[PDB]
Design a protein around this ligand. Structure first.
Ligand SMILES: OC[C@H]1O[C@@H](O[C@@H]2[C@@H](O)[C@H](O[C@@H]3[C@@H](O)[C@H](O[C@@H]4[C@@H](O)[C@H](O)O[C@H](CO)[C@H]4O)O[C@H](CO)[C@H]3O)O[C@H](CO)[C@H]2O)[C@H](O)[C@@H](O)[C@@H]1O
Ligand SMILES: OC[C@H]1O[C@@H](O[C@@H]2[C@@H](O)[C@H](O)O[C@H](CO)[C@H]2O)[C@H](O)[C@@H](O)[C@@H]1O
Ligand SMILES: [Cl-]
Length: 252
């Protein structure tokens, strides 16, 4: 490669104060972005983001850590070029109408690039892409957005490839961010990402992809037992020492 695809990002948890995002940015230009599911700056060992562009995220309608009253303030203080909105409202008992009304009130005013809420890969009634389609209808032309936002967790590369191709086929005029993806527990995460990266790097309609998750197994175990039961620790980009894992090595 003589010029990086430049689509890769760090999904950077709140508990990463010991870790350095610069470890996974060798400056070739494949890794360009970082988000932390919050509107405060990534907690890191350096106080910086290792040259990566931070994307603010209002992942809840309001929280002590991301007060929605401070969303506009934090964008202006930090100078984000992009903002992400609600995390998986399609499985958190938020109706498409509720999400549209909230998005217009709180996210619309940010005069930067904006992603609609990250939805799960569920096809069960009223979830996933069906939920997203219903939110865009509920928006009634009044939502300002640049990107749709996908999560995927499943059991094969074949399932993931089919999911992204179907998302593109069903929303052929929208640019896609993949803010979280990995296998569920019991597979080979390295083999999955070895297949996924070249596939995604070739898709002009994918702006950014963020493997779950840019942390160490020890920090994931300590702070997200839910992720460990669902995903396991095989998709952690860091070693327990804070170096690149075998999956981290794929980010370069
Ligand atoms: O000391 C660092 C900063 O701590 C800030 O307060 C944190 C608060 O932000 C934290 O909220 C977490 C979310 O951050 C967490 O986000 C991700 C999940 O949505 C996703 O599913 O998984 C990833 C990876 O594990 C998560 O990072 O989601 C959980 C709920 O699932 C929230 O609890 O909670 C911390 C513990 O209470 C809290 O200390 C503080 O506001 C900052 O000022 C400070 O810099
Ligand atoms: O997300 C679409 C685009 O939103 C733009 O900001 C919007 C303004 O142009 C418009 O006049 O007002 C709405 C609501 O206040 C804003 O969201 C951004 O400036 C663009 O970067 C973005 O592509
Ligand atoms: Cl999912």
């Amino acid at each position: 490669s003589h010029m990086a695809s430049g689509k890769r990002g760090l999904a950077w948890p709140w508990y990463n104060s010991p870790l350095d995002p610069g470890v996974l940015n060798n400056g070739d230009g494949e890794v360009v972005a970082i988000y932390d599911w919050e509107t405060y700056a990534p907690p890191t060992s350096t106080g910086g983001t290792g040259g990566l562009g931070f994307i603010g995220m209002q992942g809840t309608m309001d929280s002590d850590s991301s007060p929605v009253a401070q969303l506009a303030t934090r964008q202006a203080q930090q100078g984000w070029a992009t903002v992400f909105s609600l995390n998986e409202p399609d499985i958190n008992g938020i109706t498409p109408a509720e999400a549209a009304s909230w998005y217009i009130e709180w996210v619309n005013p940010l005069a930067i690039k904006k992603a609609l809420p990250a939805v799960t890969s569920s096809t069960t009634s009223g979830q996933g892409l069906s939920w997203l389609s219903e939110m865009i209808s509920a928006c009634a032309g009044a939502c300002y957005f640049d990107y749709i936002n996908l999560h995927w967790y499943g059991t094969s590369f074949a399932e993931f490839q089919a999911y992204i191709e179907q998302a593109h086929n069903q929303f052929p005029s929208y640019t896609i961010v993949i803010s979280e993806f990995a296998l569920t527990n019991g597979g080979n995460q390295v083999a999955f990402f070895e297949s996924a990266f070249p596939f995604l790097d070739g898709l002009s309609y994918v702006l950014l992809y963020f493997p779950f998750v840019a942390t160490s197994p020890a920090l994931l175990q300590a702070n997200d037992p839910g992720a460990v039961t669902t995903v396991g620790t095989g998709s952690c980009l860091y070693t327990n020492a804070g170096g690149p894992s075998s999956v981290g090595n794929l980010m370069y």
